[PDB]
Amino acid sequence: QLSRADITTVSTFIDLNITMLEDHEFVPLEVYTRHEIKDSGLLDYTEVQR
Amino acid sequence: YNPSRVEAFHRYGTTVNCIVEEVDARSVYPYDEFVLATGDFVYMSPFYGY
Numbered sequence: 001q002l003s004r005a006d007i008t009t010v011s012t013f014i015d016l017n018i019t020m021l022e023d024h025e026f027v028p029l030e031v032y033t034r035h036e037i038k039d040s041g042l043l044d045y046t047e048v049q050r
Numbered sequence: 051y052n053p054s055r056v057e058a059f060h061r062y063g064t065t066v067n068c069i070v071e072e073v074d075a076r077s078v079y080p081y082d083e084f085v086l087a088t089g090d091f092v093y094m095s096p097f098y099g100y
């Protein structure tokens with residue numbers, strides 16, 4: 001009696017590798033926050049009047 | 051300061067109050083002038099010098 005792995009084996013199937021799409025996490029990103037846009041002005045009427 | 055009370059007469063009273071303050075100056079490109087926290091414009095480059 002001999003084991004099943006003692007004889008050479010050939011794959012009769014046509015392998016098809018399937019790599020699922022990895023999960024992705026999106027982080028917040030802004031070129032200029034609303035605070036930066038407000039600060040872009042040279043003068044602010046609110047602060048000047050205050 | 052105001053003048054003392056003298057009947058049916060106009061009087062002029064001068065008041066001089068020296069004031070010194072620390073203000074945050076701001077400037078934008080080409081940086082040829084800058085403003086102050088009080089809203090006053092200064093037509094001189096912040097980097098002007100000899």
Ligand SMILES: *[C@@H]1O[C@H](CO)[C@@H](O)[C@H](O)[C@H]1NC(C)=O
Nearest residue numbers: 011013014015016017018019
């Ligand atoms: C992936 O597919 C290939 C054939 O494209 C196959 O040879 C391989 O054994 C498969 N599995 C792994 C883990 O690479």
